[PDB]
Amino acid sequence: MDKIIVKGARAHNLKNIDVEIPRGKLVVLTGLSGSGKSSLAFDTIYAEGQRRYVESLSAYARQFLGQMEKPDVDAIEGLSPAISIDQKTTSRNPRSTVGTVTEIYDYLRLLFARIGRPICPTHGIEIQSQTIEQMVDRLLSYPERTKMQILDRIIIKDGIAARLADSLETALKLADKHACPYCGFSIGELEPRLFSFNSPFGACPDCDGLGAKLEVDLDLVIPNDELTLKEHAIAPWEPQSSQYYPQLLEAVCRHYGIPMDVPVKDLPKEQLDKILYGSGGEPIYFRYTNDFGQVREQYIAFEGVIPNVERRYRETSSDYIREQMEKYMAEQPCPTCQGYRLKKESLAVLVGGKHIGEVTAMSVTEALAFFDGLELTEKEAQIARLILREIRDRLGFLQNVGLDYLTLSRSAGTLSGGEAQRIRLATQIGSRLTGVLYVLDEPSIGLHQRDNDRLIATLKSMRDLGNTLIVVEHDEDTMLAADYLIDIGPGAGIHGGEVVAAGTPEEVMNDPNSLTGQYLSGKKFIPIPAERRRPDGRWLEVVGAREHNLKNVSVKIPLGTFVAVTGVSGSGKSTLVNEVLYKALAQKLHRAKAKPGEHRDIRGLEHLDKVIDIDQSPIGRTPRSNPATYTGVFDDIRDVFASTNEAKVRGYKKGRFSFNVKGGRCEACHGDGIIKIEMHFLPDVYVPCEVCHGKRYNRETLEVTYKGKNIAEVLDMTVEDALDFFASIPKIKRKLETLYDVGLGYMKLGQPATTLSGGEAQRVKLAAELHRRSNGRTLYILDEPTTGLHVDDIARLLDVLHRLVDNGDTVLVIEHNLDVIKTADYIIDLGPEGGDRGGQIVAVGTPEEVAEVKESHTGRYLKPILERDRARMQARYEA
Amino acid sequence: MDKIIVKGARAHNLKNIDVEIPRGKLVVLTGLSGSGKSSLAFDTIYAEGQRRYVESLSAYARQFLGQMEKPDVDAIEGLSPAISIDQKTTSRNPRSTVGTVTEIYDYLRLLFARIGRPICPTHGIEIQSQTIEQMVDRLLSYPERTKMQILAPIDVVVDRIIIKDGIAARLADSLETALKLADGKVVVDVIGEGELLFSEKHACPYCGFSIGELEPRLFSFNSPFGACPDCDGLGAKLEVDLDLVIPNDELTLKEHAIAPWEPYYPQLLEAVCRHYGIPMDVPVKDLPKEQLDKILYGSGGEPIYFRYTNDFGQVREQYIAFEGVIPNVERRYRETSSDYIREQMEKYMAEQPCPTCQGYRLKKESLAVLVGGKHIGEVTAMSVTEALAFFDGLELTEKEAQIARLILREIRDRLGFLQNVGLDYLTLSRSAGTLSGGEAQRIRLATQIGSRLTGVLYVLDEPSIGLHQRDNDRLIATLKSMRDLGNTLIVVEHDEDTMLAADYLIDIGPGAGIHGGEVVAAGTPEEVMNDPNSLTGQYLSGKKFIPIPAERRRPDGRWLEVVGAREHNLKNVSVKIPLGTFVAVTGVSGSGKSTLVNEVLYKALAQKLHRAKAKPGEHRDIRGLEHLDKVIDIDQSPIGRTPRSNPATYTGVFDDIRDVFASTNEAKVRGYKKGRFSFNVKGGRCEACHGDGIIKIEMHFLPDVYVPCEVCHGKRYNRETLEVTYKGKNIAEVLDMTVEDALDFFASIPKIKRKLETLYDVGLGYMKLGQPATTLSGGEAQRVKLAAELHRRSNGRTLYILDEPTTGLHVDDIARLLDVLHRLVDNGDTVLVIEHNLDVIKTADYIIDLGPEGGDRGGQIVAVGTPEEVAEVKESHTGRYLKPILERDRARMQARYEA
Ligand SMILES: Nc1ncnc2c1ncn2[C@@H]1O[C@H](COP(=O)(O)OP(=O)(O)O)[C@@H](O)[C@H]1O
Ligand SMILES: Nc1ncnc2c1ncn2[C@@H]1O[C@H](COP(=O)(O)OP(=O)(O)O)[C@@H](O)[C@H]1O
Ligand SMILES: Nc1ncnc2c1ncn2[C@@H]1O[C@H](COP(=O)(O)OP(=O)(O)O)[C@@H](O)[C@H]1O
Ligand SMILES: Nc1ncnc2c1ncn2[C@@H]1O[C@H](COP(=O)(O)OP(=O)(O)O)[C@@H](O)[C@H]1O
Ligand SMILES: [Zn+2]
Ligand SMILES: [Zn+2]
Ligand SMILES: [Zn+2]
Ligand SMILES: [Zn+2]
Ligand SMILES: [Zn+2]
Ligand SMILES: [Zn+2]
């Protein structure tokens, strides 16, 4: 019927709830972070919709997925095969481009094979291929009585087509295509797989369809050009728990007279040229002590430090040894394929004057403009009719979702969470399906407010195509434009998990019991600081940052304040804030090997000792890591189990209760507790270790109890419940208090790092630094901490962030969310528009000064919000 | 929007066609065999629906499938995830049952886990398990001042207590202490001397016997947690059948009475005889029992003198401890790890229920748990009608029913869904691989009905297959239900009623192969019926139809006589099959037609006429065996299991087709012979695919796909081999020709011609000589086999047995096939068919209708004789539905004859 009813849902924290979802409409789930949206939307609805379909693809699939673990639900009538558009399902596995992911490149390959005019490299003339039917009608269009000899002698008049057709047949059979008249050169046939770099049937030999080769870089070899060579200045030759190269280094220095303890910056160019590139055949006396202790004198003609790295990387046939040498190397465009990844004769076929590689190299805009100005013939346009419209709609979708700044050539594994999510969303719009249950997860992530009205436009277009959407958003604009809106459980964890209010946005907005509803009408909101932290003389000063789309950018960052880097997606925020600033500061302060982006210099580095990048990357890459392990709480929590009498008499200490060591862990899962099961076309799944039923330890370890709870149940506790459980212990309590303030409090201590969200993982990291003795000289960089947080959750995360600034430290954040931006003291709005047309400072200073900039897109949307919230405070102030 | 539009389809023979299908309705694709229905319905619409969805399940999913070969279509907008209901996606793989495939068995495991009462086999008392909370209030219900000593197993005494009121504190903690010392078990000696005793686990108070906890996997046979140890959840053993070791209990032992020991072993008999004094010239029947036991079961250690002449000729005397003829087979079968030596010994063995698990397939303690007085295995062993009855009569408590409410309804619905489809006769225990094509297909339909999916595009393939005309309205009724659940159905049918009941009806291409591929007429079945251009409408309107014969072949004096057949549900049946006539064995599904026709009749005639090894079904005897020399069973099974086989091969035409190439001018000078052109010999085949032509790609959850070899582009031969030409076409090109274009092309060679003609006469002619057998329809395969027998010198003493030869044919096509079958009867042979298609039944000269209703309410002869004689039997469903068709077409002819 016209609605999908979900009877009795008990996912995680869902309280055996029933809910109605209006079919064929735009539904939007909302509520506090942890209330249980995903549990319903994804773990319950998407899971069933998908399983029920796949299950019916064969008799085998049903048997496999049948014995598997299903979602805890009584029933769910009205289901449709479901499709998810989240960060998990997208790709991140190298050799894959944006063009390949979106499927556009495949249509390009097909395009080139159908109408691509092949040209001769040497001659630049289009090599043709005619049948006898086309040759005869072209020869016949000459003046009469014109003697011609096929090599038999004929004379053209009128009815000679009988011979000419048969004479050219004998000639072609006597001398045997797309060949060049003046040199034989050819390429038999034009098939799509000739333009594929994932097929040796048309891939570049000297790189195997990779495009970029990989050589040594002078920058990575020596991080800071000013380092004492005695204390290891050159990186690759650092004591690897065994000293051979450190001794060779001395042998070269001692011979040429290179001072060991001098900073490399003030060392003559020749002194350094011998060490890096070699003696050039001149023998150097070299004696060294083996790890055993015995000496061995040689007389080698030192190759140098650079050729050494290239030669050691080249010669090994190990996926382990290479990776140790790849840390001091960087990619370079392949000299043969010019970085286009195809054969030389594959690039010989061009369409609108440009070849397959050049079109892939264009940004979505450039290439969209290209296909409008492509001037084809009648024959060409009639063939490519549908192939062309396909490329035009896909480029269009991408442009709609706000990704028009990135090229089709761009590697897949270098895309942001939001970028990937939206590339999948665009790629899906292209499938033009109907009667499907699309379930999206916060599609505005990494998208500016300006470009939000199109996202609402495309979602509704997809909905109007006969589908039903279920989006999980926290944005006002989208919730107001939704047809139906479901708010979930008051509070989060054991507190939420119920349907607080459901109805039209007007109804939910006027519902007193809706936590979200109150924020929509204005009865509850984020307040603007009455006064803002005026900056002082402490400034960072990046100079001449050019990297990607940056236009010789030169900006100044005020320390000891809440800084917010803003600007539309593609403007170069990542580049300036992370690729340039962080890596740069990082190798100076922490001496990390990360090569910074192209920039001139950065001053004011004498104002801080440590820069920390609170990334949105995972906490760990296995179920070993968890909030406890990362924060070291679990490390401290084991001492208490070692204190109990059971552990004393049995002789247990802080090892039997460990998670990694052989002591008391479960041998069947090797400590994991959760075995990963293999899903081929579907994403991987985690099934509990059937030997210890997911308890993490054998039957003899967890017998030790501390307050009626064993080590398993204590690790299974929640953060909120645990700080109540560990009220007395004053060291364990301080670490749990960080996790609570952070924004969690609802997640469990044992919860495997792999399952944690992007935003969740970031806060577990933010919690580790949260409570530390700060010296007032330390910079924190957070990339969109709002990702996955309710408007209310931002208010409590801002209180936490602003606590760091009060101390004196700095907190730089990259946000599009207007509420986090308005709370900030200083902001740096980046590039007008994205891509090539951006990459420059549009407006600096306090939110108000930025707001009154007619050219800033950020300030334009911030002005009605600042004036919206300024009147609300004045409305509360008077009452 | 409100309709699914397909623009420019070119699948196989489709002529770049555009077509509109109404969304959310019962659309029925119809037309001649090979017109292009599957090419559109399955190879185009369904193909796209599945891919587009699966292609979105993950990143890797897109990369794998995207690089492969997508269907030949310009655009197809308005798609929905598609699901196919055909024979290609039904499990034929051992260890799987009807219960597992339908998912009903899983719900039963969930039922038995939740509410299943576990009882002690030894003591037959419901073993219980109580928490401390339940133990305390049970003791507190006793009268006051009643002394009790809580002791824990000699049994150490915890503490004595007097029950008053506020003693719930101690009582609860002493039990807790007792359960901690004796581990989940504690005995309470009430001083009235009634030592009641309970535990935290499910255990018997009188013998220990426990079961721990009830979990679904404790009832599964695909889990060590529940599977039987002595057979590993198979339920069937595999041991030597005494009946197979001796075909008839009265055959001369001198002329090899025992079959396994049939040309060392012959000379060994001589040794066990000489010794025990068993006569050589012997009709086994009259041999004393001990004389036969020594030879079959062994001397039991006693030494027997045995000398024998080797194949070489030299003698070698031994002094062995003879094992016997029966243990010989079991021992020679078990020890070898050869798929060749086993299969030769497996011929003398038959399946037998596992003595450990009574054939139920689970642990003894798994069968300890029972619901309505019956255990899991018993409920599975019932027929669908039985089980459905059991749950109606099943009587439970308030808690049990409230716990199993959602489970019971699902089980109750699936049983009914199976009943709707007509499968109410088969059990839940029945092996999945033993199902027919129609059955498997319908099981998949029923399972699907239960999914309750919406916005799905189901594509059914002739769901009426193997279904009596009576049970057709229920099929039409359930299809529509699935439709009326927000889904669109695309059914490929040839039945009138199903077309008449359809909403939209597309008639595809006039003619088959290159002659078809177009959309002739498309609208309501009223619009298509009134369209002179629709070849289908002409049969629905009644302009064209299959005429009833003027007179029917009266049986002569020759009759086959099946006596006392009792195999599956057959009830001591005795039937007379008339020879030299077209016979139709009719009846509702489950009546026992297969059983009678193939399992009893064919296997019996086969063992007598051709020394076939198959063990016939339980029957008394079969006379009239002197009236025929051979019995050809034109099975609906595949022609080959590899792409190496194809029409050309099976018929043998491809053998001759290489002799022309081997004898060509270019072959002479190149030294090529009838081997370079061999599809299977390294000589000239493509070394990349080893002569397959198509590589098989590995789809994990999806069925496997066939990708053309990228090196020979599917041609099958290398570059040099196909340079040889014959009349401007090489071997790859001739292998790619249609049977119709081929006979036209090989008109000069009459030996090639006469084979190709059979394929044309048979109905084919649209398919290509090189079409992989793995891709042929069940019906197609049958007809390619029929074409083999089709042309041979008939001596008038052979019997043909075809199973539903109509499967996959238009009404117009049945006409031509009937011409072919009746030509066989004309020449003196007999054709027996097992059909539901009334157009075939009415044409028959004699029909043998089977059992009224299916299952155990069947397996008996309801009516025999001519179609009219059976038309007048009220008790025959066949007649009831046939009587009006005879009256309809008999009037149509008089209407035609009068003008
Ligand atoms: N991977 C997981 N394993 C176990 N429990 C989880 C997992 N993810 C979330 N939960 C539980 O579900 C609740 C949060 O549900 P979730 O769907 O994440 O809410 P939201 O969608 O609003 O973030 C938490 O109380 C948490 O304990
Ligand atoms: N790894 C990369 N390779 C090529 N181009 C890149 C890469 N990273 C960023 N860019 C380009 O730089 C510009 C902005 O990138 P980014 O720093 O992510 O901006 P923002 O953070 O504002 O989205 C875009 O034009 C983008 O295509
Ligand atoms: N796998 C295949 N290989 C080659 N030809 C095929 C294949 N499948 C179908 N065809 C051909 O396509 C034509 C019609 O398709 P088909 O689906 O058989 O029609 P219908 O379903 O109406 O019988 C026939 O000539 C048939 O031989
Ligand atoms: N392999 C088998 N094992 C057990 N029972 C069977 C088997 N095959 C058929 N039966 C049973 O025999 C009965 C009818 O036999 P069948 O020959 O299949 O009828 P029909 O051919 O008329 O459909 C049914 O009750 C069916 O369940
Ligand atoms: Zn040239
Ligand atoms: Zn290259
Ligand atoms: Zn384990
Ligand atoms: Zn007992
Ligand atoms: Zn068994
Ligand atoms: Zn090949």
Side-chain angles (χ1 to χ4, degrees), chain A residues 371-670:
Chain A
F371 282 112
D372 184 14
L374 185 59
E375 190 179 2
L376 311 79
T377 65
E378 302 291 15
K379 282 63 170 55
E380 292 173 319
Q382 179 275 309
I383 297 169
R385 50 162 59 265
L386 299 166
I387 299 70
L388 284 166
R389 184 190 67 187
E390 198 68 25
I391 296 168
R392 191 189 310 275
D393 296 2
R394 272 82 197 292
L395 276 40
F397 301 136
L398 286 184
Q399 190 177 48
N400 296 351
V401 190
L403 293 293
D404 57 339
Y405 61 83
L406 49 61
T407 56
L408 300 178
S409 62
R410 177 70 159 282
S411 173
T414 65
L415 295 167
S416 74
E419 283 172 351
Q421 192 179 49
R422 293 192 311 281
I423 292 182
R424 159 161 286 282
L425 177 53
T427 303
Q428 206 58 231
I429 288 281
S431 291
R432 321 290 258 277
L433 286 171
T434 319
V436 161
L437 183 61
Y438 288 107
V439 183
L440 291 72
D441 177 46
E442 199 180 348
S444 70
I445 289 175
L447 190 165
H448 200 273
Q449 207 71 235
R450 175 190 57 151
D451 308 346
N452 194 286
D453 287 323
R454 308 180 76 180
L455 193 69
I456 293 300
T458 65
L459 289 177
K460 289 186 172 184
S461 303
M462 165 176 266
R463 177 281 309 274
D464 290 323
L465 197 56
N467 296 298
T468 165
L469 309 207
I470 297 181
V471 187
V472 184
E473 274 283 14
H474 302 281
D475 182 27
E476 287 193 338
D477 298 1
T478 303
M479 292 173 62
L480 297 171
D483 300 6
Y484 198 85
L485 188 161
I486 301 183
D487 198 40
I488 288 185
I494 195 178
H495 294 71
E498 304 189 11
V499 60
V500 180
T504 71
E506 321 308 327
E507 289 181 329
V508 179
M509 193 173 78
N510 296 359
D511 189 337
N513 303 15
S514 174
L515 198 166
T516 297
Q518 297 179 60
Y519 275 89
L520 290 175
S521 60
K523 298 174 182 179
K524 192 68 277 180
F525 58 99
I526 301 181
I528 298 180
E531 195 76 326
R532 302 195 179 280
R533 297 181 185 75
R534 295 173 292 94
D536 51 351
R538 305 173 61 185
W539 297 85
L540 285 174
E541 300 182 14
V542 299
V543 177
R546 322 178 85 92
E547 192 56 31
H548 295 118
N549 67 327
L550 294 180
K551 280 56 177 299
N552 193 39
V553 181
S554 191
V555 69
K556 328 100 305 177
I557 306 176
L559 298 175
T561 181
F562 189 101
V563 181
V565 175
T566 183
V568 304
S569 53
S571 63
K573 300 187 295 299
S574 320
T575 307
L576 185 170
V577 178
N578 192 296
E579 197 82 334
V580 175
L581 180 57
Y582 171 75
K583 292 182 181 182
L585 296 176
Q587 76 174 33
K588 289 290 187 178
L589 301 172
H590 296 92
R591 286 145 54 180
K593 281 60 181 65
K595 182 185 182 294
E598 190 173 358
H599 73 111
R600 204 75 61 180
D601 194 12
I602 310 178
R603 287 49 159 267
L605 189 57
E606 67 289 358
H607 288 280
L608 48 67
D609 296 352
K610 54 182 179 182
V611 183
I612 301 300
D613 179 3
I614 303 180
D615 198 356
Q616 191 167 310
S617 66
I619 293 181
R621 202 149 62 174
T622 64
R624 298 296 173 82
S625 301
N626 58 5
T629 296
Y630 198 89
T631 60
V633 176
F634 178 77
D635 202 313
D636 296 7
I637 205 174
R638 295 198 315 275
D639 281 303
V640 308
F641 280 77
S643 307
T644 188
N645 286 349
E646 287 292 356
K648 301 295 185 176
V649 293
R650 292 191 174 185
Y652 305 144
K653 304 181 183 178
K654 60 186 297 183
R656 194 67 147 75
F657 296 102
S658 185
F659 197 72
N660 300 333
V661 177
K662 187 172 183 176
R665 60 171 175 77
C666 175
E667 289 291 310
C669 61
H670 303 298

Side-chain angles (χ1 to χ4, degrees), chain B residues 518-534:
Chain B
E518 300 179 19
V519 53
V520 177
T524 70
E526 323 311 332
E527 294 169 342
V528 177
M529 188 163 60
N530 304 350
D531 187 339
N533 287 348
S534 178

